[PDB]
Symmetry: C3
Subunit: 444 residues, 3 copies
Amino acid sequence: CTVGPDYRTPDTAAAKIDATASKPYDRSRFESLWWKQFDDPTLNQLVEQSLSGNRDLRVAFARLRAARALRDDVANDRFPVVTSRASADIGKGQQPGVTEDRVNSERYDLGLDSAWELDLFGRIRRQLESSDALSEAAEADLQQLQVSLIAELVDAYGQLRGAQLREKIALSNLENQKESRQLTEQLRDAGVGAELDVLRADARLAATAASVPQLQAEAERARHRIATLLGQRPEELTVDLSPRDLPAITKALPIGDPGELLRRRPDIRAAERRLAASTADVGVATADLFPRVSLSGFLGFTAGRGSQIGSSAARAWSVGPSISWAAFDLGSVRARLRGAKADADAALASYEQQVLLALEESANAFSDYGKRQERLVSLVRQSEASRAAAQQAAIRYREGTTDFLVLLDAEREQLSAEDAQAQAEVELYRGIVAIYRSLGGGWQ
Amino acid sequence: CTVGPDYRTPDTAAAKIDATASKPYDRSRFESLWWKQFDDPTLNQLVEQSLSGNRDLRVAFARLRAARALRDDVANDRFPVVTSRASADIGKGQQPGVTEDRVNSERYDLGLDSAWELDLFGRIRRQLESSDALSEAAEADLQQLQVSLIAELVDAYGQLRGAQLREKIALSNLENQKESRQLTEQLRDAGVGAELDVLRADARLAATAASVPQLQAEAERARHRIATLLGQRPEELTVDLSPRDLPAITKALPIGDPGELLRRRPDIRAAERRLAASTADVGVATADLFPRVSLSGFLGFTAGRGSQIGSSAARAWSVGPSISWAAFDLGSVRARLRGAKADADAALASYEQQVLLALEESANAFSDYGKRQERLVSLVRQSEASRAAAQQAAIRYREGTTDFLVLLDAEREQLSAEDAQAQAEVELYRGIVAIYRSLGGGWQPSAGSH
Amino acid sequence: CTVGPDYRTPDTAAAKIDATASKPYDRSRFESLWWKQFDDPTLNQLVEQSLSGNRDLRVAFARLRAARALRDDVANDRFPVVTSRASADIGKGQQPGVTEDRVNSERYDLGLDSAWELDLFGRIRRQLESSDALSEAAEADLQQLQVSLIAELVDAYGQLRGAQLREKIALSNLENQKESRQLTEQLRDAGVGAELDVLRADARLAATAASVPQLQAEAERARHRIATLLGQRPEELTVDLSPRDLPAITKALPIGDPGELLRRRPDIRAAERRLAASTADVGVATADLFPRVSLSGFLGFTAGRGSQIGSSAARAWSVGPSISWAAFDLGSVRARLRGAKADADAALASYEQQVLLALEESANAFSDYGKRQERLVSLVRQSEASRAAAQQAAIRYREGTTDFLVLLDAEREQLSAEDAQAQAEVELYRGIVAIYRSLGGGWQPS
Ligand SMILES: CCCCCCCCO[C@@H]1O[C@H](CO)[C@@H](O)[C@H](O)[C@H]1O
Ligand SMILES: CCCCCCCCO[C@@H]1O[C@H](CO)[C@@H](O)[C@H](O)[C@H]1O
Ligand SMILES: CCCCCCCCO[C@@H]1O[C@H](CO)[C@@H](O)[C@H](O)[C@H]1O
Ligand SMILES: CCCCCCCCO[C@@H]1O[C@H](CO)[C@@H](O)[C@H](O)[C@H]1O
Ligand SMILES: CCCCCCCCO[C@@H]1O[C@H](CO)[C@@H](O)[C@H](O)[C@H]1O
Ligand SMILES: CCCCCCCCO[C@@H]1O[C@H](CO)[C@@H](O)[C@H](O)[C@H]1O
Ligand SMILES: CCCCCCCCO[C@@H]1O[C@H](CO)[C@@H](O)[C@H](O)[C@H]1O
Ligand SMILES: CCCCCCCCO[C@@H]1O[C@H](CO)[C@@H](O)[C@H](O)[C@H]1O
Ligand SMILES: *C[C@@H](COC(=O)CCCC)OC(=O)CCCCC
Ligand SMILES: *C[C@@H](COC(=O)CCCC)OC(=O)CCCCC
Ligand SMILES: *C(=O)CCCCCCC
Ligand SMILES: *C(=O)CCCCCCC
Ligand code: NA
Ligand code: NA
Ligand code: NA
């Protein structure tokens, strides 16, 4: 028989996210290769190269092989273990109870030794159950690393495109501000301007100019992150990352049934498999409450004279049945069993915490995405109005019917609005990534 | 003998925090349930719910159970370990020393086997001292998690109230800016305005409007964090978290004597107990320099014929006193003892680092709190002057004695000042949390074991 | 024999950082005491005190000692292990084979017990090779912690200087803003001003005043970080941290050949030593495919009567040669060997990851530093233009027919620019730190 608890997966309720019933989302299908929806072949090539090259993923694959090797070793314990031996014991001395003379003694043995734990209460079965669950946990850990890797990479690519977009914006605004700085100098030098206007124009041109190397530094840091995520050195990136627009998804997002997310996410499965392994380990400990039945054997040759080894006259066999039971040391056995029970309770609570964290992450991703869409509508309006204002202010300054501060402020506001809108477009992109990461998108 | 060093807790000096003698603080009392002084029943409910629901606290209690179980196994080594066995050896072959004929041979044994390490140099006593200290470490780890959980929860609630407060401010400013934008449109349509005024007002309104969903998103993140902290799913949070004012404490903070903080913090006790355990482990290794004295026994039956087991003619007993000593392998013993001494040294330095980190955290919390109060005084003044300016600019713009940019700039400044003051009020709240977390308040004493 | 793979350090290509063939850098030598280039004696004394007092460094040295002790234990397995014993076995019962009567039995033994694994396939030598490499990894971990600690400390000191500089700038700007507010109130009181000017000036003053305690709190946080990094309590710091200018390095930075950084970095060596150890462990597992040859021994006394112990009549010796082989359990041995190989594949992939992270760190540090220099050029210009604008705006506001907003906006821009420039100066200093951290600076080879 097999003693100890018989594991049953927790009866975990499906995820419920009411917001997913609204129009930004499509619950009728889930895209597993979710990043392909951006229709960006550069991004797709990055992801393919990362899955082949990423070194953390290679570590995880190796850990899975290591777990399977451990399970394979334990699985042999279900059967007799038959090893081989040639040994002797040779000496001279008294033989207490036989003689007080110092006598020569010799014994020689050559043969097969067998050790067999008969698995009557399932200690070994439970060890294998545990090892098998831990191999499945390691597979789930690998899948989770793929989910996390793909999301990190797709996210970094967005950050790269964002920095490139923000640089383009900064440079376009810098050109507008260089044009008005030129105009302040021309009006000043024709006697219808002011040194104060030029100085203010110079200060704001320099502020804008200072943003450009900061954005370039951010783009470079993103490129270097991408290289490492691909398993590549910074100078050896294969994929051309010259500027392109930030990608977008204009269809409703195919998110499937949010109720499936806890079954899809590999981190949840890994934690469930760790729980299953810990539950089996309670059974391993439980079996020690019961007797241990074992059977040793020897087959081969035994002799007092080494010259006879291998002959018919020295053939020998032996069997060694044994039953052991903790008896008065059952207290120690019970202590170990309490320890296994505690470990299993820790694994259950840890599994439950992983569920809660997954539900938090998904709730956050959906809440953030809806709000990022809303925020973008306002920022687009802000940018449109700010451009029109700056255009009108420039006409009026040139024509002498407004003061330079009106134009300066309008230019400041145009840049601020256009850069905020860009950052919000990046946030939307990153929000898509956060949704698919939370849903357990992307693994093999 | 119980060999090896006798552990003595480090003579660590009391924390000294000079700033605590000032008017913001009350050293005459300490409040263990420190969050109650916010007089916020919703907060109190959240904390109490968290203590029964939080899953990380369940892990930590399980880890404590596990440490006790390890101790209980060690504790039994102080006595004879008496197990039971029924065994045989059955075979056919030569019997070296007895005969060279291949003969049948049988031996049967049935009885109690006893194994006993006489603990003459206290090796087992030191092992139990270590296990007992590690159980205490695990109790302190749970208490430190309670401290950390409560501070994190109270802080998250502040962040929620802050996002709600900032939303209210954004919407109040948005209303003012809608009125201004309407006025620009009216003046334009009267032929006494300008399209430039309207466009600038439209841009400002949209900027303020864009802030609202960002603040709403922050509030939802805070709500979801609170749910997990309570051990609840996001959609099953019961507690009504509809907006309320950010809580405040207007009496001097009851912080007790800062000299008690190192003794109160469970993280410092956890590290001290690990030090104690490591020092006991030096004693375990020191015992192996000395001989190990043991006594085995058998009581039951032994026979050559399985048929005689259980008969008086098969009764048997034996005792096996034994002394062993490492002798020429003392070099290995000494290597293990160097290893144990190095581990104890690591535990001591770790302990001292935890002390320093605790003193850093408390120093930071007190310095931050006094500066946050000072900061808020100036921001309150900024907000007041900024509202007066925006009101007067709006009057002047409507009458035609100031240009729109003067109004626009004043509206910008009003929002900037009000929002800054709200962030500073949240920082003050968070600063109170940081003070209490650093003082090690709020944990439940353990019943322990007997 | 010593079986299993014979470890060879990976043939990892040298780092290539093209941008270091530029003007801000001196590739002709590397300054190992890299922080001394700031010519800041207070900083220098912080570093020395940290090396003396930092408790994390103490933990790491203790871990190194523990790894060496482990190794020393393993090394004794190469020889016979000879222990000592005094024992007796006394009882009453049958003696299967010998007799069916219940007879009294007494036996006494006193001597040396020897156990010896003959290391014919190198199992034990592979164990020692592993343990030796893990002790070298512990040493590299300690050296990496020192690199990291020194960088963290130097960085924290720059942050402290930054907060003190920004506080100075805030207070200077506050003074200018108080003067402007006085003028608003005078102009109002002389009937050529406006209450609206005064209110806006008061709001501005309050805003700048609010920044001061925030910057002071940042400076105190940095002080307290510094104390811990020194191994000191916050109120006991032994180094005077009263305000001083942020340090600067005007000569080209001595960075050596960037191609050497992977050999200098202790984290890379620690990962390489863990890969060497895991490679040895494959050998340990490999050795179990082969027979294990052992020899036990006893030398001493054996008697039936206790009084004979130690006498020539009770002299006794024995030897126990043995050879064992897994035979039908070779499948278990093979499983363990697959596991060891997997563990060594993980170590190799971990080592390569550590190389990529180092190359990323160094690429980021050099890219950032060049761009931080460029950015500071623009910000210096911004500050200069902003100060001149604010002075001219104050002249114009006094000339008495311009709205205060022109002055207010110029004063906001002056403070914004000066503060931004200071932050950028801090970022340049922190960028130097990041460069040297990324190159493996801060530990000294013996
Ligand atoms: C992790 C929670 C552990 C609770 C253990 C309950 C499950 C079964 O455990 C065991 O199976 C044996 C069957 O003969 C019984 O004899 C044991 O005494 C019983 O407790
Ligand atoms: C006293 C008898 C004990 C059981 C004897 C061993 C029974 C079979 O044992 C099996 O032998 C096979 C080869 O023959 C091996 O390959 C297997 O690993 C082993 O389990
Ligand atoms: C050969 C005798 C085998 C008897 C079965 C072992 C004794 C079982 O003892 C059981 O152990 C558990 C310990 O946690 C307890 O929960 C049960 O109450 C107790 O009955
Ligand atoms: C076949 C063996 C006969 C001996 C039966 C031993 C059963 C005793 O059992 C154990 O002994 C101790 C009581 O002092 C405690 O550790 C346990 O509570 C008890 O279950
Ligand atoms: C024939 C039985 C085994 C031979 C044992 C070889 C004994 C040499 O062995 C050595 O003895 C030294 C004492 O001089 C000790 O210091 C060493 O630790 C031990 O390795
Ligand atoms: C088999 C019985 C022989 C027992 C001899 C015991 C000698 C114990 O001697 C002990 O050895 C330690 C190791 O060097 C020293 O540190 C102690 O000072 C010493 O008392
Ligand atoms: C029974 C004890 C076996 C001892 C093995 C002999 C010692 C071999 O030692 C070996 O020497 C070689 C040549 O110098 C080196 O290349 C090996 O790395 C080293 O381990
Ligand atoms: C005294 C020598 C005994 C002979 C032992 C023969 C061992 C056979 O070794 C075999 O290797 C196979 C590899 O394909 C595996 O299937 C098995 O684990 C094993 O039976
Ligand atoms: C597995 C345990 C408990 O289950 C059974 O009784 C099944 C019996 C199948 C042989 O029992 C054993 O295997 C031990 C035998 C108990 C007899 C007293
Ligand atoms: C690994 C090899 C190396 O040993 C030799 O080549 C001979 C020296 C050993 C005495 O060891 C073996 O595989 C030994 C083969 C022995 C065959 C009976
Ligand atoms: C419980 O399942 C025990 C397994 C029975 C196998 C046969 C024992 C002779
Ligand atoms: C590797 O072949 C090991 C050989 C060592 C020779 C010594 C034998 C006693
Ligand atoms: Na096995
Ligand atoms: Na025990
Ligand atoms: Na040893």
